[PDB]
Enzyme design. Structure first.
Site, mmCIF file in Angstrom:
data_model
loop_
_atom_site.group_PDB
_atom_site.id
_atom_site.type_symbol
_atom_site.label_atom_id
_atom_site.label_comp_id
_atom_site.label_asym_id
_atom_site.label_seq_id
_atom_site.Cartn_x
_atom_site.Cartn_y
_atom_site.Cartn_z
ATOM 1 C CG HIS A 113 -29.090 22.262 -4.165
ATOM 2 N ND1 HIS A 113 -29.152 21.457 -5.280
ATOM 3 C CD2 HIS A 113 -29.267 23.527 -4.601
ATOM 4 C CE1 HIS A 113 -29.344 22.205 -6.351
ATOM 5 N NE2 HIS A 113 -29.422 23.466 -5.965
ATOM 6 C CD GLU A 132 -7.077 2.328 -8.787
ATOM 7 O OE1 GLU A 132 -5.969 1.783 -8.537
ATOM 8 O OE2 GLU A 132 -7.943 2.589 -7.927
ATOM 9 C CD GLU A 172 -28.584 18.053 -4.574
ATOM 10 O OE1 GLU A 172 -29.759 18.225 -4.168
ATOM 11 O OE2 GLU A 172 -27.927 18.964 -5.125
ATOM 12 C CE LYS A 200 -5.092 4.464 -6.231
ATOM 13 N NZ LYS A 200 -5.511 3.055 -5.965
ATOM 14 C CE1 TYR A 221 -7.594 -3.905 -6.894
ATOM 15 C CE2 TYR A 221 -7.093 -1.569 -6.618
ATOM 16 C CZ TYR A 221 -6.904 -2.890 -6.257
ATOM 17 O OH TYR A 221 -6.030 -3.202 -5.263
ATOM 18 C CB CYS A 248 -3.202 2.878 -1.225
ATOM 19 S SG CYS A 248 -3.266 1.224 -0.515
ATOM 20 C CB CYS A 305 -0.963 0.022 1.181
ATOM 21 S SG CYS A 305 -2.062 1.458 1.185
HETATM 22 C C1 LIG Z 1 -25.957 34.187 -2.509
HETATM 23 C C2 LIG Z 1 -26.793 33.038 -2.011
HETATM 24 C C3 LIG Z 1 -26.268 31.750 -2.057
HETATM 25 C C4 LIG Z 1 -27.018 30.663 -1.605
HETATM 26 N N1 LIG Z 1 -26.479 29.416 -1.661
HETATM 27 C C5 LIG Z 1 -27.167 28.340 -1.231
HETATM 28 C C6 LIG Z 1 -26.606 26.966 -1.275
HETATM 29 O O1 LIG Z 1 -25.457 26.756 -1.715
HETATM 30 N N2 LIG Z 1 -27.352 25.944 -0.835
HETATM 31 C C7 LIG Z 1 -28.600 26.123 -0.356
HETATM 32 O O2 LIG Z 1 -29.245 25.125 0.044
HETATM 33 N N3 LIG Z 1 -29.182 27.352 -0.285
HETATM 34 C C8 LIG Z 1 -28.535 28.477 -0.693
HETATM 35 N N4 LIG Z 1 -29.138 29.748 -0.628
HETATM 36 C C9 LIG Z 1 -30.488 29.840 -0.068
HETATM 37 C C10 LIG Z 1 -31.552 29.481 -1.085
HETATM 38 O O3 LIG Z 1 -31.347 30.189 -2.317
HETATM 39 C C11 LIG Z 1 -32.904 29.833 -0.494
HETATM 40 O O4 LIG Z 1 -32.960 29.338 0.854
HETATM 41 C C12 LIG Z 1 -34.054 29.269 -1.322
HETATM 42 O O5 LIG Z 1 -34.003 29.827 -2.636
HETATM 43 C C13 LIG Z 1 -35.387 29.625 -0.690
HETATM 44 O O6 LIG Z 1 -36.443 29.193 -1.530
HETATM 45 P P1 LIG Z 1 -37.879 29.912 -1.431
HETATM 46 O O7 LIG Z 1 -38.833 29.170 -2.341
HETATM 47 O O8 LIG Z 1 -38.193 30.121 0.023
HETATM 48 O O9 LIG Z 1 -37.594 31.384 -1.995
HETATM 49 P P2 LIG Z 1 -36.966 31.712 -3.431
HETATM 50 O O10 LIG Z 1 -36.314 30.484 -4.031
HETATM 51 O O11 LIG Z 1 -36.164 32.974 -3.254
HETATM 52 O O12 LIG Z 1 -38.306 32.013 -4.273
HETATM 53 C C14 LIG Z 1 -39.048 33.227 -4.188
HETATM 54 C C15 LIG Z 1 -39.564 33.545 -5.586
HETATM 55 O O13 LIG Z 1 -40.788 34.280 -5.528
HETATM 56 C C16 LIG Z 1 -40.722 35.427 -6.388
HETATM 57 N N5 LIG Z 1 -41.620 36.433 -5.791
HETATM 58 C C17 LIG Z 1 -41.406 37.261 -4.744
HETATM 59 N N6 LIG Z 1 -42.522 38.002 -4.497
HETATM 60 C C18 LIG Z 1 -43.458 37.623 -5.387
HETATM 61 C C19 LIG Z 1 -44.854 37.984 -5.694
HETATM 62 N N7 LIG Z 1 -45.481 38.933 -4.964
HETATM 63 N N8 LIG Z 1 -45.469 37.344 -6.718
HETATM 64 C C20 LIG Z 1 -44.848 36.398 -7.455
HETATM 65 N N9 LIG Z 1 -43.580 36.025 -7.224
HETATM 66 C C21 LIG Z 1 -42.860 36.590 -6.226
HETATM 67 C C22 LIG Z 1 -39.252 35.762 -6.502
HETATM 68 O O14 LIG Z 1 -38.961 36.393 -7.745
HETATM 69 C C23 LIG Z 1 -38.599 34.394 -6.393
HETATM 70 O O15 LIG Z 1 -38.432 33.778 -7.666
HETATM 71 C C24 LIG Z 1 -28.408 30.878 -1.075
HETATM 72 C C25 LIG Z 1 -28.928 32.180 -1.037
HETATM 73 C C26 LIG Z 1 -28.175 33.256 -1.487
HETATM 74 C C27 LIG Z 1 -28.793 34.633 -1.419
HETATM 75 C C1 LIG Z 2 -1.149 -1.081 -7.629
HETATM 76 C C2 LIG Z 2 -1.958 -1.347 -6.387
HETATM 77 C C3 LIG Z 2 -2.853 -0.389 -5.922
HETATM 78 C C4 LIG Z 2 -3.610 -0.620 -4.772
HETATM 79 N N1 LIG Z 2 -4.470 0.339 -4.355
HETATM 80 C C5 LIG Z 2 -5.226 0.168 -3.244
HETATM 81 C C6 LIG Z 2 -6.185 1.199 -2.765
HETATM 82 O O1 LIG Z 2 -6.322 2.275 -3.379
HETATM 83 N N2 LIG Z 2 -6.901 0.959 -1.657
HETATM 84 C C7 LIG Z 2 -6.780 -0.190 -0.963
HETATM 85 O O2 LIG Z 2 -7.475 -0.350 0.064
HETATM 86 N N3 LIG Z 2 -5.926 -1.186 -1.338
HETATM 87 C C8 LIG Z 2 -5.138 -1.079 -2.440
HETATM 88 N N4 LIG Z 2 -4.249 -2.102 -2.840
HETATM 89 C C9 LIG Z 2 -4.205 -3.329 -2.031
HETATM 90 C C10 LIG Z 2 -3.438 -3.165 -0.727
HETATM 91 O O3 LIG Z 2 -2.188 -2.504 -0.961
HETATM 92 C C11 LIG Z 2 -3.226 -4.545 -0.130
HETATM 93 O O4 LIG Z 2 -4.493 -5.227 -0.065
HETATM 94 C C12 LIG Z 2 -2.598 -4.477 1.260
HETATM 95 O O5 LIG Z 2 -1.314 -3.855 1.177
HETATM 96 C C13 LIG Z 2 -2.451 -5.875 1.839
HETATM 97 O O6 LIG Z 2 -1.770 -5.824 3.076
HETATM 98 P P1 LIG Z 2 -1.025 -7.132 3.619
HETATM 99 O O7 LIG Z 2 -0.633 -6.860 5.050
HETATM 100 O O8 LIG Z 2 -1.855 -8.333 3.249
HETATM 101 O O9 LIG Z 2 0.311 -7.268 2.727
HETATM 102 P P2 LIG Z 2 1.297 -6.079 2.276
HETATM 103 O O10 LIG Z 2 0.765 -4.740 2.730
HETATM 104 O O11 LIG Z 2 1.621 -6.331 0.825
HETATM 105 O O12 LIG Z 2 2.621 -6.365 3.123
HETATM 106 C C14 LIG Z 2 3.334 -7.593 3.020
HETATM 107 C C15 LIG Z 2 4.749 -7.333 3.516
HETATM 108 O O13 LIG Z 2 5.412 -8.551 3.848
HETATM 109 C C16 LIG Z 2 6.748 -8.513 3.340
HETATM 110 N N5 LIG Z 2 7.161 -9.916 3.203
HETATM 111 C C17 LIG Z 2 6.742 -10.820 2.295
HETATM 112 N N6 LIG Z 2 7.322 -12.029 2.533
HETATM 113 C C18 LIG Z 2 8.105 -11.895 3.618
HETATM 114 C C19 LIG Z 2 8.998 -12.769 4.406
HETATM 115 N N7 LIG Z 2 9.163 -14.068 4.063
HETATM 116 N N8 LIG Z 2 9.637 -12.226 5.472
HETATM 117 C C20 LIG Z 2 9.480 -10.932 5.823
HETATM 118 N N9 LIG Z 2 8.682 -10.085 5.145
HETATM 119 C C21 LIG Z 2 7.987 -10.504 4.058
HETATM 120 C C22 LIG Z 2 6.674 -7.665 2.092
HETATM 121 O O14 LIG Z 2 7.923 -7.034 1.807
HETATM 122 C C23 LIG Z 2 5.609 -6.650 2.465
HETATM 123 O O15 LIG Z 2 6.169 -5.467 3.039
HETATM 124 C C24 LIG Z 2 -3.461 -1.905 -4.012
HETATM 125 C C25 LIG Z 2 -2.552 -2.860 -4.488
HETATM 126 C C26 LIG Z 2 -1.802 -2.627 -5.641
HETATM 127 C C27 LIG Z 2 -0.833 -3.687 -6.110
#
Ligand SMILES: Cc1cc2nc3c(=O)[nH]c(=O)nc-3n(C[C@H](O)[C@H](O)[C@H](O)COP(=O)(O)OP(=O)(O)OC[C@H]3O[C@@H](n4cnc5c(N)ncnc54)[C@H](O)[C@@H]3O)c2cc1C
Ligand SMILES: Cc1cc2nc3c(=O)[nH]c(=O)nc-3n(C[C@H](O)[C@H](O)[C@H](O)COP(=O)(O)OP(=O)(O)OC[C@H]3O[C@@H](n4cnc5c(N)ncnc54)[C@H](O)[C@@H]3O)c2cc1C
Lengths: 450, 451
Positions: free
Chosen positions: B440, B181, B445, B50, B177, B47, B42
């Site tokens: 969101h 990768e 989600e 890689k 895999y 791991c 690993c």
């Molecule tokens: C900059 C910013 C970033 C944000 N980022 C996130 C985020 O990443 N994740 C997240 O979950 N939330 C985020 N929010 C919050 C999210 O946008 C609001 O919580 C969500 O839109 C609320 O939904 P609503 O239906 O209550 O009101 P709104 O979605 O605001 O809907 C109100 C609508 O009614 C209309 N309206 C108003 N008065 C009247 C009327 N008298 N007649 C007809 N239509 C009317 C408006 O034009 C508007 O379209 C963010 C807010 C801001 C300001």
């Molecule tokens: C290219 C590649 C990518 C991988 N990517 C991932 C990943 O992203 N995620 C993941 O979870 N797993 C991954 N694996 C698998 C993971 O590395 C192994 O499942 C894990 O290392 C197994 O652990 P182990 O203790 O069984 O043996 P190892 O970790 O291989 O250790 C065995 C050790 O024993 C030693 N040894 C062997 N024989 C003797 C001896 N006679 N005397 C003394 N020492 C000895 C060796 O030198 C070695 O150090 C990957 C494997 C490969 C080949």
């Protein structure tokens, strides 16, 4: 007045979700949208923000990591307008998917701004529409501070309207929107300054997530400005804006983004004609079934009191409401507990449930156990730019139920969904231990903690 | 006289190190015998190297395929394979320092040399005898080289990581895999790559959705796949290049040929015939659920285990649980070989857990299974002129719809399945997947929004 089984006000995340779902079960639905379908998320939120995040990630790759992997690369330039056309073209394909879906479900899409006339009637383009069930899903809009020169700044909408890359930007706000924008701008080569009102950004996140985000910003991100309360924005003679802070300090920039919050758009739909109750800040009150105090009027999404401002919340809430009203399922409702969140910051953040301190207040300090893992993602470990990744499981009770899960680092944005299902099933540390790790990945660090 | 230890681990790889350290944590005086480099397959030639090169390949794809559509004007002047080897081996070296430090704090006596059994309780290394009441065989495997003419001109996975310069043209022979990768990494890094499989496709034990998607992505922007290709001979041409000759009459001229047709266990040549320990036809050692052979005091974990799973985490956990049992008195401690998640770092990466669509049909019956799927384009590539498909599938069984199989292929899928692995260990049903709220906007989600 034309009659519909269901009227959805707002064609955003919630309106569309609910309107389609209700139509699937034979309902005659009217979907009313003033601007563009898909609302904030699709047009000026999630989607455009993510497209730019991907662009910023490509920049980081070429600027920070490529060289150490053996690449002799020369980034000759970055065309912001090219990114914008690709972003908007993608947003365009989304609009035509909705028009195909909504068309196949016979949802009558009405382009216009809706206002209530009474409990059961709404007006749009001079015409009255009535229905038994009416969903209010109008969402919010950005909050602009009441200070002098406030009008010189732009909001998240204006930011997505920028045709060209500003040279220097002040991002004002501490929430995820400000952090995401500030991070994307810096990665794309803009001199970026992030002004937060108190000790740090993302104050509602776990200290591990805050501390790591802060240290990564200080070394390779936007410039952080703590204890920065805006006082005034001066438009200088040369065209630049100068942000003056209440503490006496100031910063000169080309563009300034207000990302200090959002408020519900419930002030211009004539609610005073329906009897529907709202709280002081304009949010609409509802029962566990998304129903207001006036029967036949419902609400989902950002404008809902005690809601969660994410797209999937409004989608699920809207669909479950349509299940209830039109598919004979009176218990169908939304579950607002353990909703996962991802912040597309640099680096990205993933979180579900309680912070370390929230769990201490809920269960008591001595009854909670915290597991952690600090590491460098293999992706950046072979380069001049080591990036830290940190993960945390917050456990409570003797069974060590995972009440909180937090992560920050490369690809964390994608590893959280699955742990969310497990937490929804009441996973414990032992459940996390029962699975065999996947090597080599960042996600195994969530299940190899001791 | 033989030196006495409480535990002797033969092989210092994934299974050997995990087990030695864990046993030592409980006060056991352990001897860890390794003939080559610590970390085994690993860390040194699996791991890790890689993955480092898979990241290099991903960076190349970001620059070649996606950069300009995101607005970047990039000049990729060249790729220096030797610099990548330098960085990769520098990282591996830092992992070796960590193992020396950890094994050092646990007081594990590391012995450098090749171990051979003397009898049931004794092994020889560098002329000295070592004995103990518990001996773990964890010698791992070795790449299989086919017996055909000119086979020695080809290299294997080890020789591939020994390459100090990028070959222009390569023939990767195999359907597993490892072949997939390596072929995908070489192709993305700028090498003309030819993948040769003996039957209809690569990864034939994976779900048809995964196979069909990988095949269609390779055809478009990956290596060139050669099906029904049975190696017959490898000719060493006068110009230094190699020509691969297939039984069907076809041939391919390349610069290097990589054999990735399988691995066999390194269980011969250690004098097992003196212990009484039995091995099957292929050289694998049979063990019970507690990793013990038919000879008391002799255990086995990792790749040489009959019916085992050839992944590092499987060796690591089986070695850890064996030490929990023997040295922390937990007689019920053992390894659970069910629902082990797998990830292939192909282009694009594959994630899988549990049964394939057909396996679930044979076990539960065609009429009692339900398959859910999601076909989409990751936002990362949907804004480009190189759109890449992503496919995900949930295979459910019973009226409860227990998710007995999960399959994915696409950008970042590699990082999204560990968590679903927890849920499936907890017995997750389709309704458990539905009970979570989506994140969101992410690719993940798509696993929880299927209907
Ligand atoms: C900059 C910013 C970033 C944000 N980022 C996130 C985020 O990443 N994740 C997240 O979950 N939330 C985020 N929010 C919050 C999210 O946008 C609001 O919580 C969500 O839109 C609320 O939904 P609503 O239906 O209550 O009101 P709104 O979605 O605001 O809907 C109100 C609508 O009614 C209309 N309206 C108003 N008065 C009247 C009327 N008298 N007649 C007809 N239509 C009317 C408006 O034009 C508007 O379209 C963010 C807010 C801001 C300001
Ligand atoms: C290219 C590649 C990518 C991988 N990517 C991932 C990943 O992203 N995620 C993941 O979870 N797993 C991954 N694996 C698998 C993971 O590395 C192994 O499942 C894990 O290392 C197994 O652990 P182990 O203790 O069984 O043996 P190892 O970790 O291989 O250790 C065995 C050790 O024993 C030693 N040894 C062997 N024989 C003797 C001896 N006679 N005397 C003394 N020492 C000895 C060796 O030198 C070695 O150090 C990957 C494997 C490969 C080949």
């Amino acid at each position: 007045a034309t009659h519909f089984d269901y009227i959805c006000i707002g064609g955003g995340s919630g309106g569309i979700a609910s309107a389609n779902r209700a139509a699937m079960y034979g309902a005659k639905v009217a979907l009313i949208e003033a601007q563009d379908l898909g609302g904030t998320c699709v047009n000026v939120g999630c989607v455009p923000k993510k497209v730019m995040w991907h662009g910023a990630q490509i920049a980081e790759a070429m600027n920070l990591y490529a060289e150490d992997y053996g690449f002799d690369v020369d980034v000759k330039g970055f065309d912001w307008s090219k990114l914008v056309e690709s972003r908007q073209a993608y947003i365009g394909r989304i609009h035509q998917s909705y028009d195909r879906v909504l068309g196949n479900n016979k949802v009558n899409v009405i382009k216009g701004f809706a206002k209530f006339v009474d409990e059961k009637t709404v007006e749009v383009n001079g015409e009255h529409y009535t229905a038994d069930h009416i969903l209010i899903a109008v969402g919010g809009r950005p909050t602009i501070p009441n200070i002098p020169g406030a009008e010189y700044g732009i909001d998240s909408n204006g930011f997505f309207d920028l045709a060209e890359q500003p040279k220097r930007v002040a991002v004002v706000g501490a929430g995820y929107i400000a952090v995401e924008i500030a991070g994307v701008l810096h990665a794309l080569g803009t001199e970026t300054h992030l002004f937060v009102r108190k000790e740090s950004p993302l104050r509602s996140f776990d200290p591990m997530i805050i501390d790591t985000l802060v240290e990564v910003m200080e070394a390779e991100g936007p410039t952080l400005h703590t204890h920065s309360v805006p006082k005034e924005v001066v438009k200088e003679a040369d065209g630049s804006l100068t942000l003056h802070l209440e503490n006496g300090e100031s910063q000169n920039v080309d563009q300034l983004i207000w990302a200090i919050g959002r408020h519900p758009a419930t002030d211009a739909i004539n609610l005073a004609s329906t009897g529907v109750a709202t709280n002081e800040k304009g949010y609409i009150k509802v029962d566990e079934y998304q129903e207001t105090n006036v029967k036949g009027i419902y609400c989902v999404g950002d404008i809902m009191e005690g809601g969660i401002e994410l797209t999937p919340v409004a989608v699920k809430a809207g669909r479950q409401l349509s299940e209830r009203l039109f598919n004979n399922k009176p218990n169908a409702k939304m579950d607002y507990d353990l909703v996962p969140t991802v912040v597309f910051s640099h680096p990205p953040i993933g979180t579900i449930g309680l912070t370390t301190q929230e769990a201490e207040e809920k269960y008591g300090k001595d009854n909670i156990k915290v597991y952690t893992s600090g590491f460098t993602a293999m992706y950046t470990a072979v380069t001049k730019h080591r990036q830290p990744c940190k993960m945390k499981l917050v456990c409570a009770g003797e069974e060590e139920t995972v009440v909180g899960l937090h992560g920050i680092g490369f690809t964390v944005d994608e590893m959280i969904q699955g742990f969310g299902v497990a937490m929804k099933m009441g996973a414990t540390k032992a459940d996390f231990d029962s699975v065999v790790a996947i090597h080599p990945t960042g996600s195994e660090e969530f299940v190899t903690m001791r």
